[PDB]
Amino acid sequence: RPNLVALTRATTKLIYSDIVATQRTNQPVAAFYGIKYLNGATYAGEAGYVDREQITELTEESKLTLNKGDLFKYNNIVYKVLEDTPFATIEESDLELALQIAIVLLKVRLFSDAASTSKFESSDSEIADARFQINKWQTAVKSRKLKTGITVELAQDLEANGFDAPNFLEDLLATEMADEINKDILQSLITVSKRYKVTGITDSGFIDLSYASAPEAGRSLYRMVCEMVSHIQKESTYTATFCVASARAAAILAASGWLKHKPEDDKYLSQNAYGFLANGLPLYCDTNSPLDYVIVGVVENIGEKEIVGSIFYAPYTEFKVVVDPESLQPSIGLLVRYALSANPYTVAKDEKEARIIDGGDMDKMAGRSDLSVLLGVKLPK
Amino acid sequence: LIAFDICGVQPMNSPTGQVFALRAVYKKFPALAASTQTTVGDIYTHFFQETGTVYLQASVQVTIDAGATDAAKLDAEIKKQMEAGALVEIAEGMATSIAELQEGFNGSTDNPWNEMGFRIDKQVIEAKSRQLKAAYSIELAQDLRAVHGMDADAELSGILATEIMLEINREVVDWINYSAQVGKSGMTLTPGSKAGVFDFQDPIDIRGARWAGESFKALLFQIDKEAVEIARQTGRGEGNFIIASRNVVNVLASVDTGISYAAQGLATGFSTDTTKSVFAGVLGGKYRVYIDQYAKQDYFTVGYKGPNEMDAGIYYAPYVALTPLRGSDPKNFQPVMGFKTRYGIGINPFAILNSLGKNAYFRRVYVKGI
Amino acid sequence: FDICGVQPMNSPTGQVFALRAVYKKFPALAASTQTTVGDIYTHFFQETGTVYLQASVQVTIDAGATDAAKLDAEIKKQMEAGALVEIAEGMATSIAELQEGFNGSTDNPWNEMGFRIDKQVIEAKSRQLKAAYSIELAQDLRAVHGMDADAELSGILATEIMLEINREVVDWINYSAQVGKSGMTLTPGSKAGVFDFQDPIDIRGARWAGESFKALLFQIDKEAVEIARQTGRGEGNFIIASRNVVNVLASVDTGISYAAQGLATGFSTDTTKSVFAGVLGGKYRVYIDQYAKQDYFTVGYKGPNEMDAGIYYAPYVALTPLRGSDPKNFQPVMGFKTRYGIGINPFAILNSLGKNAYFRRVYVKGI
Amino acid sequence: FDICGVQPMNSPTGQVFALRAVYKKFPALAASTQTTVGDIYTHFFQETGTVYLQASVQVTIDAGATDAAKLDAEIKKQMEAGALVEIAEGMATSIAELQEGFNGSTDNPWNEMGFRIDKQVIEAKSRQLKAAYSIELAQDLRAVHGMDADAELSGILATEIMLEINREVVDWINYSAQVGKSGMTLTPGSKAGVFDFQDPIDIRGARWAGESFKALLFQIDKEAVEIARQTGRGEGNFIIASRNVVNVLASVDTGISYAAQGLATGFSTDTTKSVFAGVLGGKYRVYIDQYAKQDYFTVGYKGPNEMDAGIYYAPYVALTPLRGSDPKNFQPVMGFKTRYGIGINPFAILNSLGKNAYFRRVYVKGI
């Protein structure tokens, strides 16, 4: 449908198509695909895991029974012991930190299980299992529709404006549609994004830059946002690729030197971006939601496929415009439909659960992205 | 695929609008008594204390007990003479014989220029309309194309056209069954029957049948009786067709099966084209039979149709058919499509006031026990 | 499967379409009233209740029939006398027409083309089978008789997986089918859902198996009608039944249900035991449920339109072969997989059981 | 011969192949339960056991029926009403399918195909006959009738060895055949393995030959069904039966067996009774067991592939003449020798007696 395709081209250009992953459908439902792993380091092979089980959990009472040449693992990372009694000289009570110290002081050594070809082939050793699984799910294509191209005396007005009006009105209608769609995307993204939480929520409470807290510069938020990106790096094999925030949350609040107003409009920045941050990421802005929040997360691809995302979008065409003369009024109806969903496997142990849930059911997917986080922000209204 | 081969058509080129129909214009026996010396061939009437009266023709020249002064005694003697075959009972046959004799005897040239018993007249009918709404959606129209390469509206149209034609054919049947007289009654009633209903489990209706086969044939025979009554009242002819419920049609179809097409070509080719808009076949080589796909209960109507379009008892005179309508509903922009016709109906006058339960061209019977 | 809407789903999920349907005040018959020929009058009998009687005769109904019991007697006498006849719902048709004719008006009385027409998303449900054979067997099948060995196994195997699929389709038909010989299809003395050849009611008084077997086919026609009625699509077009039932039904209507008699004649030149045998009554294509659990038949409807089947089978990925080898014993691996998916006219699996008007299932006893 | 596989020898031992096959708590119905259409409940009646009942009608089963006797009465009433319908395994399947589909999975459910296919080694077992005739016979057959003496004896001799071999194969079939009219093919009032024409149950109420004989065919079809089920390959294709049984069957279906009318017409011109009588019901190629011991029939299956017989005849040598003279009385020697041996689907010779799924043998009484 070339006329709808032309409207598609002229309408999807108006939404934040890159803050979600984009896939497409041709079905009444969209088959979506995505990638997930539940714990990141070294090999994921059975041989690896078994050797790890067979050496030690590095408990506090056992860390000193280790000597030169021994292996140990902690938090699934295998380390070799350099010289005797590693940690003998480390008073640190938090074993994880003691380990970090031991690595630096060369008491232990990050250990690689890489080996000769012969070792592997001779023993008929096991092999790395997959880190990530590839999931598939489907959701219904959902829609919205408008009766907004009002005509009658309006036709007369449009005739007066007849030099532009035919196309102008369809483009305008498409624009308001795009606006609600963009907002719909944001609602889903907002919902799925995990609540960023550190020590009882972002330093033991949601960041608060209110008058009674820290009406500073907005620096403390910029710092927190940058940390949100760190969180993404910690939990997933990706760096943040986008950020969206309200004006009061960051689009304006961080404009104290840690936000750039699109100095350049064509390099590493979409046409729909409000700007970008000093810590990168094209920056988007919602402007609608009562939340006044910040979202940090990642969209990523393998070749042409946007397989990674918290939310996936899959439009379905064969942007329909219909002209109907109710009585005296040949108004223009506009219909747009698409699938939009979160990866349901983030709320499932396996397919038996995935098969009874819906990635489009945002009452379940709420807070379960893992490819995005949200910062609640209290502000100096 | 419109039925209507069982009606006059006489199509309109204007509503109001008219059709023609060949509307039909439409004994003092000596008593038998004690001491009566009958004479062979003579006909005597006798009122019995029980079960009314009889008309008996003498086969024997016998005196009926001159001592039978007691009506009870007289009835007994007459009964004995009847048992003897001396006196034989016929009812209308006797009335006719004496009436014809009386006319012959007192016949006169005079001026007995009677009329051919057909008035022949016409009715004015409006091109009464019927119409359907496709009531479909954009989303299916789009998905149908997108998913299977289907033509959407074109297919909806095919359904719609079929449905309006079926609904029209249905209406025709409702009119037939509105106006039809109820059969298995009167001249076609079995004394032990249930008044207008044929019950396949009832020994009377099934004529002493054994198992379903013979019970099914008994219905066939009730149909022939209905066909006769139609001829008797119409003055035009024996029922020529049957409209009946699927249950009835299957029953008839099971008997002398060559009468109907099982549509074995349809079954063989795995539902090539069900064509569920036509007549099944011809029962007994006499009645073209059609399935009422919307039968309300379970029934059969026998009807007459002469070769002349003016001899149906019911008329359909199409002026407009399948006019496609297209549109949309602006309240939500869903597409709109539909079909409209204008055809009108006619009914032999029989004087819809003079139609309900009065139409001599059709006899309807309710069926139980299938 | 050849009675299903194929709607082949070139992608799983995936859906099929179905043409799902959208889904007496006669003044009085009473003492002293006078009926008029052709009209209809309402009456409630003290026993048997409401009837509707139509006049053949213009007559005063006993003006002295004060007592309802007396009136009931008079009304019955008028029926006995041929003055009155009885029709029930058929009179409803007449009142509706009387009212509609009388009040007909152009207005906006558009009727709907009373079909919902809808779509149902389905998964391409999979199925898989292994060849499970040794190399030595394959070597000998070729070496000894010139057989194509594993290719022959592939043929058998592929046939077998397809048979299992067809089995599944039938099992779901018998799940979704409504219980037949019920409601509209009952004889008052019948046993509801089961046709028992030893029961004189079910066999309608049949004398010996010949007549009884015909009686079974008659119940089948009754089922075909109920399907026709509820779906609004017409008489059932096919029958699926157990080996016992098929043999019984194939005893009537000559060899119309085919045993592929030419194969028998030629000493099993084939057996072709995978498809519909033929056409019972000249009306219903009949297939054999080769896995029937008890003894039964199901009557169903199939239109020419793939959306008018009531059941859908959409063979995405059919008979795709697998190949491999297992070095532990260095034996061959061969097998087949499919991803077909199924579905029905929604009629709202939970909304399928005992609900689908396109099919009616009856249990058979006494064979 | 034409009802078995052949797979000829090239040497004894020697082998054949065979297509050997590999080989849920419906909720209780109780007082007050509102059944819902399509749903199925379990109900054990105090008398005559449990059935599952499917609802056709949504209905509450007498909440006051706390007395199991009362509950049975209400349930029976609802069944009479057509509200509830009894089915046994059709139901067990329906629930099993629901449970597996609904709570099913993906995983890797590779089943093996139902067929294993296997092989056997067979020696070319020998058989032979001698004419055992004298010179004086030969001299006079020529001198008196102009006959070719031993030439005729040879024709007889060859015929007898042929018949004897076919007889042996049949004996092995009857040996290995399972006994029919058993298990899955029993009439509840039946006599276990024997069809008795004088028994109204077996003959389905039949009177005289017409109906009684058709009733035997009815049992034959049931036997064909059991074969189909157990072999996994399809209904029986042929019948071996005694002369009495064959004549009984021949009397029905009009043209199934040939009377060889030309033979009778011409006064026994050429009997040729070494072939199949014809095809029973158009379904089973039928042949007379000329050596039947009691009175009986065996129904058997044969596919187009020689390995799909259940029994295999593998000729190596046939009609090798034997010739000579015996000096003790100097009488001529004539004879024939053959070598073949047979195979039998393994079914696991001791694994054949009464175990062969391709055949069902029934003893017949009352003819």
XYZ file of C-alpha atoms in Angstrom, chain A residues 8 11-12 14-17 19-20 142-146 173-189 288 313 315 319 334-340:
42
model
C 4.609 5.438 7.225
C 5.182 9.419 10.332
C 7.626 6.965 11.912
C 8.562 11.495 14.059
C 8.862 8.945 16.901
C 11.709 7.826 19.130
C 12.321 4.755 17.004
C 14.956 4.141 22.228
C 13.342 0.797 21.611
C -2.535 -3.009 18.627
C -3.902 0.192 17.306
C -5.133 3.690 17.635
C -7.447 5.644 15.465
C -8.370 9.292 14.923
C -2.935 14.223 11.386
C -0.008 11.890 11.067
C 1.954 14.137 13.319
C -0.524 14.040 16.185
C -0.704 10.287 15.736
C 3.068 10.057 15.942
C 2.989 12.120 19.052
C 0.637 9.782 20.890
C 2.644 6.798 19.612
C 5.845 8.220 20.886
C 4.134 8.764 24.226
C 2.853 5.160 24.209
C 6.381 3.988 23.644
C 7.567 5.954 26.544
C 4.853 4.618 28.819
C 5.964 1.058 28.021
C 9.639 1.920 28.390
C 4.120 14.404 29.495
C 8.424 -2.275 18.281
C 4.704 -1.942 12.952
C -1.212 4.669 8.345
C -6.336 7.843 10.493
C -5.418 4.318 11.524
C -2.057 3.144 12.772
C -1.227 -0.232 14.221
C 1.844 -1.890 15.648
C 3.066 -4.407 18.076
C 4.973 -3.104 21.056
